[PDB]
Structures are given as C-alpha cells and as structure tokens.
C-alpha cells in the first residue's frame, strides 16, 4: 500500500476548507449571484468540503488510535465518516446534474425556466437532493459489501462519463455546426430601412411590392422539403390572398423539382426561382430584406439555419423538427407539421395576416432570441463552465472508480492489486476535486471574482480591528 503522509490529507483538507467557505460566503453575500445555477454550485461546494474535511478528519482519527490501542468505537466512527463521504459524493453528482438541467433549460426555455425556479423552488430541490443522498449514503455504507452498491456507484460514474463525452462533442467538436457566427450575421452589414432593401430587392427581380417569403436550400425529395413548399404554392395560387405574396425560391438539385419550380415561375409572376447557389453575403442581404423565411425541412438537427435568419429580422416559418423546434418559439416564428403542404400553406396565410400589423417587435424578438445562442453569450459560457466542472470531476474520480471496478472484477488479479495498492493516491486526487472546483468558479465567473476581492480587503481589515 502506497503510503502518503497524514499531513498531506490534513493540509489539503484545510486548503479545501478555506476555499469552499469562501465560495459559499461569496454567493450568500452577493445578491448578484442569487440565481438557481449559483445555488446549485453552492450545494456542490458543500459536498466538496464535506468530502475533504471527512478525509482529513479520518486520517487525524486513524492516527489517534495508532497510539491509544475499543473495536466497536472504530466501526461506529468509520461508518459515520464513510457515510458522510458517500452522501456528499452522491450530492456531488446530483448537484452537477442539476447544473446541467439548469444549463439546458436556461438555453432553450430561458424565460419559462426562470419562472418555475423561484428562490423557494431551489430550496426544496436542493434539500430534497441532500435528503435522498444522506439516506442512500447510509444505506450504501451499511451494504458496502453488496455487489449492488458497488455496481450502483460504478454506474453513476459511467453516466457522468457519458454525459461529459456528450457535452464535449457538442460544445467543442460540433461547436461549429450549430454555433451562430455573430461576426458575419450582423445587421450592421445592412444599410437603410427594411422596406428600403425589400423594395430594392423586389425591383431587382422585376416584381411588385408584397409580403416576401424566401426559401434557400437543396432541391431534394424527403429532406429539405422544397417539394412541400412547391405544393403549398400551388395550393395558395388558386386563392385571392396569393396576389399579396412574393416568393423567392433559391436552390439547386433535383432536375425535375426545379423544372417544377421553374414552371410555376413562368405560370404566376410573383414567384422568382434562382437555380444557382448564391454567396453567403447575398443570403445575408436577403435575410434582412424578405419578411419570412420558409424552412420546411424533413430533418434538421441544428437550428443554425434559423438563427442566421432571425439575426437579420427574418421571421422563420419552419417545421417543428430537430433544432428548429428548440430554436423557434411562439414569439419568434411559426412552426408547422413536417411534410404537410396544407398545414404549411396555412402558415403563409397566417404570416400574411400577421404582416398587417407592425412586425418590428416580432423581428426584435427574433434578433434577441438568436442573439442568446452566441458562443460569447452567458448561456453558452455557462455550458462550457459545466463541461469544465464535469471534466474535472470525471478526471479526479476516475482512478478511484477503476479501483472499484477491479475490486469486484479482479481483486485476485496480480496487477489489479498493483493498481489497487495505490489507493491513497486516488484519495488525495479526490480531495483535489474540492480544491480545483473553487478555482474553476473564479476564472469562469466575473462577478464571483469581484466578491472574492471584496473579502480579501475585508480580511485585510479583519486583522486591524482584530489586533487593535
């Protein structure tokens, strides 16, 4: 068994002690941190220090009975220390998952999630988590010799591992497939008013002024859904409201589908078809000129195609599918059933009646909604903070949990025991989780860094009046 000096356990437990009370004191003393996310961080800080304090208390205890030399007092104080550690570890996971649930809802349903999660509601949830964790922690240590408990602890680590893997491929690997580029999709690249650009755009195609609906994508059957839009135009073409609408269909692909599209372009007059792929700069101008963009996709994993349109005031009419369903709300667009040309055509009729009011507030909601999905926004930065916190937890607890796997899968294997003999190294690594976590909050929260500086100045004054 690899020996580590008991001072190391007591030292790091003290550093983790002062660090985590500073975290709890700061959030409590700062009303600017009275949000559900920081409340769940506070519960993680409590479970962090309780693990490090118990481990430092355990090594101090163990050293004491190495000098006195009852067997019943050992088992009692051992089951109590280990139960506090077990309960805090379960709370450590529940708090991390609660931050994940907080981040997911603060990103896609921000206004809603803020209303249910009142300052009361966080209290019951955090208390309910610690109640179930303390109960489960005691039951786990009682049956610490059962294969069900060790497998239960192992399964909860693999879920945190799978969640960290999911967040890594989302926020880093595919950070670039669903991330909105605000440096390019900006209103500042436009000049004049909206009707100014729209009238100039409709004049470029030799067309009268009307409510403009625009489609851009690939011409295929059963994907981007241009076949649905062509059928929807044919439906509306027989109605009297068709004359007030203007349609700009852009795309290349199925030669029989554009021959369809080009046939209606020759049949009506308020329909313009462009069978080439235009530059992204022209697409940007069209987003700030047309009134609505129609995204009738059969399958759309990322709502990025919507976010770019809503950046320039374009109100999306998309299928409630994949990313479009999560991006577009009732205040920022119109959703329809995928593959339904009749349901689609009704949304253009709804958008036609909607255009008879002042849509400036609607377009401002779209710009504001798409703005909140920027990587530099507070929502994306919170999910990156959650990914750092879970990555730190997985790395710090991985050696201990591999040791747990070896304990039930190969305790006799001559080099499972070689890994198992370094158990003390995995213990101090566990306490490093409660030391790195406060540092993570500091470099990821600008407000928490400000409260930390106000305390070192009050701690510099906590010695003047102390000694004088």
């Amino acid at each position: 068994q690899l020996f580590v000096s008991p001072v190391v356990f007591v030292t790091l437990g003290v550093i983790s002690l002062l660090e985590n009370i500073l975290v709890i004191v700061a959030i409590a003393k700062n009303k600017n941190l009275h949000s559900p996310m920081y409340f769940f961080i506070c519960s993680l800080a409590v479970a962090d220090m309780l693990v490090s304090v118990s481990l430092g208390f355990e090594t101090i205890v163990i050293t004491l009975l190495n000098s006195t030399d009852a067997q019943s007092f050992t088992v009692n104080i051992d089951n109590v220390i280990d139960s506090v550690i077990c309960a805090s570890l379960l709370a450590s996971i529940c708090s991390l998952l609660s931050i994940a649930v907080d981040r997911y809802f603060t990103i896609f349903y921000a206004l809603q999630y803020h209303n249910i999660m009142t300052v009361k509601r966080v209290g019951i949830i955090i208390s309910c988590i610690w109640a179930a964790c303390t109960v489960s922690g005691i039951l786990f240590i009682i049956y610490s010799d059962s294969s069900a408990v060790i497998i239960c602890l192992i399964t909860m680590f693999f879920t945190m591992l799978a969640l960290m893997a999911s967040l890594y491929v989302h926020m880093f690997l595919m950070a670039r497939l669903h991330g909105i580029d605000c440096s390019f999709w900006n209103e500042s690249y436009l000049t004049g008013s909206r009707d100014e650009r729209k009238k100039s755009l409709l004049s470029k195609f030799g067309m009268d002024e009307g409510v403009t609906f625009m489609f851009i994508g690939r011409f295929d059957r059963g994907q981007k859904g241009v076949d649905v839009l062509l059928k929807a135009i044919e439906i509306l073409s027989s109605k009297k409201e068709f004359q007030e609408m203007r349609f700009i269909i852009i795309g290349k692909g199925d030669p029989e589908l554009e021959g369809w599209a080009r046939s209606l372009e020759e049949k009506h007059g308020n329909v313009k078809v462009i069978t080439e792929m235009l530059s992204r700069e022209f697409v940007r101008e069209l987003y700030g000129s047309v009134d609505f963009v129609i995204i009738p996709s059969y399958f759309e994993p990322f709502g990025l195609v919507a976010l770019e349109a809503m950046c320039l005031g374009a109100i999306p009419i998309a299928s409630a599918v994949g990313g479009l369903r999560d991006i577009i709300t009732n205040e920022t667009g119109i959703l329809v059933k995928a593959g339904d040309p009749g349901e689609l055509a009704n949304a253009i009729l709804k958008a036609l009646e909607l255009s008879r009011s002042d849509l400036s507030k609607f377009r401002e909601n779209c710009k504001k909604r798409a703005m909140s999905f920027s990587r530099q926004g507070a929502n994306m930065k919170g999910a990156i903070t959650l990914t750092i916190l879970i990555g730190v937890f997985v790395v710090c607890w991985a050696p201990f949990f591999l040791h747990l796997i070896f304990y039930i899968s190969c305790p006799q294997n001559p080099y499972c025991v070689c890994f198992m003999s370094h158990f003390n190294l995995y213990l101090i690594l566990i306490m490093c989780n409660s030391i790195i976590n406060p540092l993570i909050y500091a470099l990821r929260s600008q407000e928490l860094r400000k409260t930390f500086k106000e305390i070192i100045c009050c701690y510099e004054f906590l010695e003047v009046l102390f000694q004088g």
């Binding site: 068994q1 356990f9 481990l55 355990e58 090594t59 205890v61 163990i62 009975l65 050992t74 088992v75 104080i77 051992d78 280990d82 550690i85 077990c86 240590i141 610490s144 060790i150 201990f400 040791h403 747990l404 304990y407 158990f423 003390n424 213990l427 566990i430």
Partner: peptide, 8 residues
C-alpha cells in the same frame, strides 16, 4: 478502520 472505503 481504513482511509476511505474499499481500500483493502
């Protein structure tokens, strides 16, 4: 009475 649990 060991440091942590499952160390043995």
């Amino acid at each position: 009475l060991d440091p942590x649990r499952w160390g043995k």
